[PDB]
Design a protein around this nucleic acid. Structure first.
Ligand code: FAD
Length: 456
DNA sequence: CGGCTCGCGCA
DNA sequence: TGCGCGAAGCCGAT
């Protein structure tokens, strides 16, 4: 409804009804940013057509107890900057604590909202909140895909087996959906503390903090500055300094040649469409430009496709039949080593390369992309069962990665353990036909000793 | 039937 | 280091 630079294919109606006379309320969950936000822009256009103001509601759930301080501070500090950014545009931001299924419905009734808009996320918990909200509200409810360049329900209607099947589909719809972002218009009609919730949450997560021998924290919070503004600087530095050499050095953990955009992209502090727009105009190495675009467009959005069309995305049942049969037949194979969650967590294994990868995960919260494959695949090799390996890999990924609890993580773990979006390889013990990685293979691609010595 | 985001031999 | 084969099941264009 309404909009000249707005594609209607980015919005879908979750619930029909009579449009109320109150303000249009935007339920911000995934895209925590002010600029290049389709969901916020569409909420403004609906408000403009109805001559009502637009407001933003963020519901703080109990999910931060499962995660750590590193994710809590990163999200909270970005929200504090976001509050000022919306305030400059005369857009009020309301922060609620509790279950969104009950808090959002209460806010709609109390604030007398006219229309409700929310961003899209294929996670299981989001669909549970939406269904609860729908039964408690009586105004139209819309969903906007502000995370993907091409809407998830529009790119493909089925689960995609491999990237080479999804690649032609995505690139065919690029000329339509890849476009510039109109500026956010400030509100014409004007009508909890973020510091207190930060202090309250931190005290609850203090006992669960990872520590060293001398009770010293392992996490180093100066590597990534949270916030919308800092994410712009990371993109600018990557395009100017790192994008040219990305194609040749993205598989070398000893070189900081990655975009470092996943923590910002996970919380929606920067738009992946915005990154694509600046990358496309950038005149750099054609090989590196193609390599980076294949990651942020295909592999990032196919991860949303995997979780959207597979409700068991974090389970063994989502694996392909060939992988399940191979893993089933190799259940009784004697493992070379057996490690529990705690031994994996502290990095007390016989592999010095695996332990160094974990320390980078512990200290920085963002382990290098190449070593994540080795990190996850060796968990399967040294665990009781494939279910145990999937349980440990998901737990350590969500607990310590800044980009954890993301569709890119569940798809990545399933790729490493269950061969999702992959193919069969040579037959092996324990791991069967799942793709294999060895220490000697990494030794021939990068300086392993430098990586190991960098992280003890 | 062609071709997919590893190890390994060889220059 | 970069290149080409090997080992493996299956989708998708016909
Ligand atoms: C076992 C495992 C677990 C992972 N855990 C997570 C996670 O929790 N959260 C997360 O966001 N990513 C995860 N990834 C994906 C990938 O490792 C990260 O996106 C990347 O390492 C982050 O560094 P970067 O963005 O600087 O790398 P870049 O090469 O600069 O990545 C560019 C962008 O493309 C996307 N992308 C790149 N590689 C992948 C990939 N393999 N799968 C999906 N999208 C990709 C991301 O949006 C990323 O920001 C995981 C991968 C594996 C193998």
């Amino acid at each position: 409804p309404r909009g000249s630079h707005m594609n209607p294919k980015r919005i879908r109606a979750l619930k029909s009804g009579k449009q109320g006379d109150g303000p249009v309320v935007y339920w911000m969950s995934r895209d925590q940013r002010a600029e290049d936000n389709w969901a916020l822009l569409f909420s403004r256009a609906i408000a403009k057509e109805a001559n009502v103001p637009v407001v933003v509601v963020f519901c703080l759930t109990d999910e931060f107890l499962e995660a750590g301080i590193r994710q809590y501070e990163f999200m909270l500090k970005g929200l504090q900057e976001l509050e000022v950014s919306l305030s400059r545009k005369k857009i009020p931001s309301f922060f609620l604590r509790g279950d969104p299924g009950e808090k959002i419905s209460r806010f709609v009734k109390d604030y007398n909202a006219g229309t409700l808009v929310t961003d899209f996320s294929p996670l299981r918990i989001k669909n549970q909140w939406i269904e609860k909200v729908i039964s408690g509200i009586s105004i139209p409810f819309f969903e906007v895909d502000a995370h993907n360049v091409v809407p998830c329900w529009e790119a493909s209607q089925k689960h995609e087996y491999a990237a080479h099947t999804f690649r032609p589909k995505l690139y065919a719809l690029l000329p339509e959906f890849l476009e510039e972002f109109p500026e956010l218009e400030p509100n014409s009609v004007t009508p909890e503390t973020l510091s207190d919730v930060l202090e309250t949450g931190v005290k609850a997560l203090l006992p669960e903090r990872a520590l060293l021998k001398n009770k010293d924290p392992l996490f180093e919070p100066w590597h990534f500055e949270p916030g919308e503004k800092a994410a712009k600087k990371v993109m600018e530095s990557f395009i100017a300094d790192r994008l040219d050499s990305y194609g040749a050095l993205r598989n070398d953990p000893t070189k900081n040649m990655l975009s470092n955009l996943s923590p910002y992209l996970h919380f929606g502090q920067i738009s992946s469409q915005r990154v694509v727009l600046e990358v496309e105009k950038a005149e750099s190495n054609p090989g590196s430009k193609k390599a980076f675009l294949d990651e942020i467009l295909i592999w990032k959005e196919i991860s949303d496709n995997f979780c959207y069309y597979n409700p068991g995305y974090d389970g063994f049942e989502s694996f392909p039949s060939w992988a399940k049969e191979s893993l089933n037949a190799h259940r009784n194979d004697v493992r070379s080593h057996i490690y529990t969650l705690e031994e994996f967590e502290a990095g007390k294994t016989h592999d010095p390369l695996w332990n160094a990868s974990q320390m980078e995960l512990l200290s920085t919260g963002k382990m290098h992309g190449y070593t994540r494959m080795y990190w996850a695949k060796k968990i399967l090799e040294w665990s009781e069962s494939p279910e145990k390996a999937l349980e440990i890999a998901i737990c350590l990924n969500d607990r310590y990665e800044l980009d954890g609890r993301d569709p890119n993580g569940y798809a990545g773990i399933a790729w490493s353990i269950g061969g999702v979006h992959d193919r069969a390889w040579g037959e092996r013990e324990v791991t069967g036909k799942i793709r294999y990685m060895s220490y000697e293979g990494c030794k021939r691609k990068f300086d392993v000793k430098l990586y190991i010595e960098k992280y003890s």
